[model samples]
Target: MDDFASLPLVIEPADLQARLSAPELILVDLTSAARYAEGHIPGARFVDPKRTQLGQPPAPGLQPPREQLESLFGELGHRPEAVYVVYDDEGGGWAGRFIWLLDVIGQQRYHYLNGGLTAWLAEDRPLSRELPAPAGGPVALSLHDEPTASRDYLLGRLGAADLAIWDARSPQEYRGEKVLAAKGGHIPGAVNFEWTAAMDPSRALRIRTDIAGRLEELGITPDKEIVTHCQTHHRSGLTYLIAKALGYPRVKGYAGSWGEWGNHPDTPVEL
Candidate 1:
């Protein structure tokens, strides 16, 4: 009983409802194609949350063009031996920002169905309004921007000591009394936990079982080097997948967050 199972990132809706036709699994369905034709899951595949972004703005959470992510992995057939899983019907913040764009394109197998599609439609499961069939091809991606942390590499890790950042917004947008940008607050030793406080609305939104003791009481301890962000990292994309699903081994994802650090101007703010 030791393999308490944490495969690829995590899964379980009755273990993907008993692996619906597994062939290495794929699932993905970020939602809206008319809410994925009104129902989904069986062969899921819809993933359009702006293909994880590079949409445009002071920094619309960058990271897209590597020939548009190798043409979004050949139009999402992606299969480097398939395992993907991803899910979103609003809970894992676009499925943890499409697993932080497959960890800046280094693509690590991937998984996250933990409570997506609202716990697979509250366990009444079975929904497939049919779609996934295209399968495309050609994958060869490689971009690994080292878990991504730019904005001048977090302004040269400002006050490093193993860095820490993590401001998932809200608390009046981390106390600058809420303003989308051009100067508000946070990121000068950021810490405010709010990515929906690590979710878990009665467990369906998953992720909050004291989230590593409330992120080590908010100093976000995993021995530092964390760096999540918001106001454009889309709530730090589920706080960088809850600091890599709570194990936190040097997480990073400032994806030009705070819309490029509160709209640049030589970045440095605390309110």
Candidate 2:
């Protein structure tokens, strides 16, 4: 029943190509509608990236409402035995966010298509314009808070030696030179490792082979509890997934991110 039992959290294009017909496989495409319409993996279903977020201001990256999730999963034909394989055009951002959503819902069986569509195309993998048949059905989900870090939770733990806040924004944003919110700079003790830094563009945007070494050098090691965030958690989505793929054991995403942190009147910031 578990076709993905031997696979790693971050799987290559070939790994997924072999499992296309697995009954338990649910291939999700988080790419744009136009790209999906142009061509996609056989049996892959498209999910609008916007739907992956709350889509509200002041912190659009917050998890979507439970009702929204239930409906979304129902449409995806969610089941206890289902094993999701998610991907997006922009490497793993949206796809990673979807994995985070699955985490919040307590679904443990999932895989990220490393490098996403880019690598698939780079390898000249098959693409299909024919849409798959609807697999929609009812689903019941129970949300969990373990994968998330709230603003209060972060404020209380700021500067803790055992905690590492991975700020996956640009260096400009981290240095207070590029402001996307009311204030600039970053969380007082947070470390800046831009999300794209983890991707190797020469390898079709795959996760860098040296990511673990790079993160270790930045003090974002596996021993600490890592909390990642970006302007709105969109970019941090991939960062969160990276930590998980590394088997870091303790990883959480600060969904509110800078949109909420930077705008807050009391949250501490460092240039």
Candidate 3:
């Protein structure tokens, strides 16, 4: 058994190789169509990341309505008994978000490929061009409201001793220099550790070796409740996954994130 085989939450590429042909496993590739067509894990189904969201304005970062999610999962062949292995081209941005959706739907039998396609290709693993047939059936989804944090909840939790808000935006965005919303700043007391920093590009986008220590150094300890977000939750998706992989006991995604906070005139901001 490989190092990742035992870890039910996060699966390593090598472990994935061992289980590539497992009947109960569902491999999902969240890369672009071009990338998927170029090369993807064998028997992997394709799901564009954009389809996972509302894909509109006002509050685009929020998860799509329950009906939309049901349809998507139904098409992806998601089932209670199936374990999903999700990966993306750019680190874990999209892949992480997909898993977060699964969490919202209360389906916890899934794992994130450590480095996604980058690590898969780095290992010189075989890729397949053949399309996978859909695992036909009704979507087994049960939408829940507890996995996410709303703006009101976050506002109330401000400066809370047990809550740590991880702002997973770039330096500029975190510093209020790059504005994607109406305002240019960050959530008061939210700590910044750009999402990409947790990825080791030298190691095929794999997680940095000292991620646990790094987060601890940044005051992101496991005892605290972790909430992550970006301008639209796109980038913070990776942060949410990172926290989970790091073994944080309590993790939640701020679905509204800055898209709602920064735009709201009454919300507090810090420079």
Candidate 4:
């Protein structure tokens, strides 16, 4: 029995340890190759959320084209019976985006690595170099339009007090500290979480329980219209997942993140 039943969307390291060796479980390590090779959870597979994408931004950050993603996910041999786990260097944001993709595509029986490899190692959990090749075939994926958000989507609601945008970039970017920072400031009411805050002293995630509390401290509410972005949505990918895992079902990622919004003169800034 797990202490967190409501958080079925996420799986803790201890719980995963027991089930990982089982054939029915598919552990997808979303981390980069270098990190994966270094030492990933034993019996984990690799996937790059950046390259193999489903939903994409309009300019770059909205939902990705359905066909490409469907074929790609199918190639990976995703199955309805198998459980999927996504993890990366960045608080499993990349992994989380994939999880979001699974949910959007109507695939269940998946979850993100609660504390990621960091926490896994923190507890001295053993990891192996073994990798899982794609199974015989992944599920036959289908796409349906869902309520996705982009910079334009946020721009439409920009000045509204009710709607809040959160940038996972650093304070420097939020204040438009550098020339590359979004012009003027961040979106009207957007706050900055820096993405790294979710980590512990070792720089991995603190805990699932703690992360949820931290999001609130940052004034992020999944229940609210939360839109998270970063330099290229990479960092925010984790934030987007955190929002979802933490109980905010209404969240979306501003995929272009700072890459699109920061450089564009027309997009509003908050600082």
Candidate 5:
């Protein structure tokens, strides 16, 4: 019934608690199976984070095949009017990535539970140990290409004045000190902003209040076409979501990330 029409892209635990009975709500828990078995939001369905990716080496962050995504969403009860509320234990990384997957599939109705399960538990919200029964049927998705950026796509637009590459890895990785691939360093013009830096630990990992300003200071402004990536796009997932939540007009996630870029012979890097 579109009960969450007025809700923002990022909602608080209290907001979700209030809507626990929304018929169209599909609460997805991206936490591990063991954690979900312990406790999760009432009526939440568990989804293994690994299933969201291609699960191959060099670029494991790549989006899984369309058929697999269709199956995944089908299992999650995909429906035209369904509103997804996704969360994960480790802040919004997996949850954000899940939301990104939704975008790729052209599913626009979704929300990120701010601070995820961390904030929920910090607020002493109730959790359920029982698993929700599967309610979803078959789904045939028409995946969109706009939300993703391939290596060649990035290379072609590298020096564009209106393009900003956000590197969401640690400073050490950005500087070639902690290499996770055949090569080190980051995309030539990418700005380094570790994913965790945007999280407010004091606020149970809620996004920092001044994130927009902080990003602007780093030249990752809303005007530019923002492309974000981490080692495997796991960390960049949060960055990509943050940009979309902030109303950035153009945003994309380089799913291959450094896993592909760093290992490839053709992709250039900068220290």
Candidate 6:
């Protein structure tokens, strides 16, 4: 079989089970440390999300600084060149966030384990409770903010046919009829699709075959430039991955997302 990274972004359980034997790959189990310790994918390492958060913002839904993120991942032994396949106890959210972190830091050598540990165990893939010996410390990760979007980015690219911004929140949040700050709806040009629509009924992923159909149903088309976001950039991560999985050639996860947009006074929004 081919290596895991060579496998699809939402990897198959049997493929992952086989790739666990490779020496170069680094599997990160992004779940509660307690659960990770209790049981995890064999050869996986532990990294808690909370440790990555440097200081809490007094307000709701802002991101931690980029420096804090680079320092955190580097301390965990990650290097930009090494393959980082992120997985979580939850199906997609946590893994999606980790992948978003990579995008922000200008690193793309990563993938998400679809259906996560549940899919792995269900397939009778390898599992282990014991931890491995220490690897050396991580190589530092360098970050550049340009690949991510900001209010300035939207304004500068304003009306550029190449840029399409998407809000991946539920229609309720997008419609402004539910928990939100700005008068609900979306970015003027954004196409609204809940990130969950890309998942299968089993809550695993739906791959390339039907992706175009789903986007067309939501009125999103193939040729537009894509930028996806939601509250605090969490759900947008899921959408970003799905777009990538479905073969949208150009896509981005706006790191700050609606948490910043909804709070800002003057940015335009639609309802």
Model 1 stretches astray by more than 4 angstroms: 1-40, 46-68, 75-94, 99-118, 127-131, 138-153, 156-187, 194-196, 206-235, 239-271
The alpha-carbon root-mean-square deviation between model 4 and the true structure, to one decimal in Å, is: 3.5
All candidates: CA RMSD (Å): 15.3, 1.0, 2.0, 3.5, 1.0, 3.0
> lDDT of model 6 at residue 59?
27
Per-residue accuracy of model 6 over 105-149 as CA lDDT, tens digit each: 666666678777767766666678988665654445566664457
> Model 5: per-residue lDDT, tens digit, 131-229?
777867658889998999999999999988999999999999999999989899999999988999999999999989899999999999998999999
TM for every model, in the order presented, reads 0.35, 0.98, 0.95, 0.82, 0.98, 0.84
**How does each model score on lDDT?**
0.78, 0.92, 0.86, 0.68, 0.92, 0.68
Candidate 3 global CA lDDT score: 0.86
lDDT of 3 by residue, 1-271 (tens): 2322466576688888988888778889999999999989998999998887887877888999877877777777776577888999898989988888878988767889989999999999989999988766556567877778989989999999998889999989988999988888899988998889989999999878788888888788899999999988888888898888877879989988899999997799999
Estimate candidate 1's alpha-carbon lDDT, on a 0 to 1 scale. 0.78
Name the lDDT value of residue 11 in candidate 4.
72
Where is model 4 poorest over a 10-residue stretch in terms of lDDT? 1-10
Candidate 1 lDDT tens digits, 131-227: 7676665466778878888888889888878777878888897889978877897878777888776888897887777788887887788888898
Candidate 2 to truth, TM: 0.98
Deviation from native of the Cα of residue 182 in model 5, angstroms? 1.0
Name the TM-score of candidate 6: 0.84
Give candidate 3's total backbone clashes: 0
lDDT of 3 at 135: 64
Can you list the residue pairs that collide in candidate 3?
Answer: none
Root-mean-square deviation of candidate 2:
1.0
lDDT of 4 by residue, 1-271 (tens): 2222244776778777877666556677887888888888987888766554433433455446766666557666666566676676566667766766666677656777776877788789887776666565444566543534666677898766556577887787778876464364676778888777665655457434577667778677665788777776667777777777677867777766676776776776666
Model 6 lDDT, full chain set: 0.68
Clashes of 6: 3
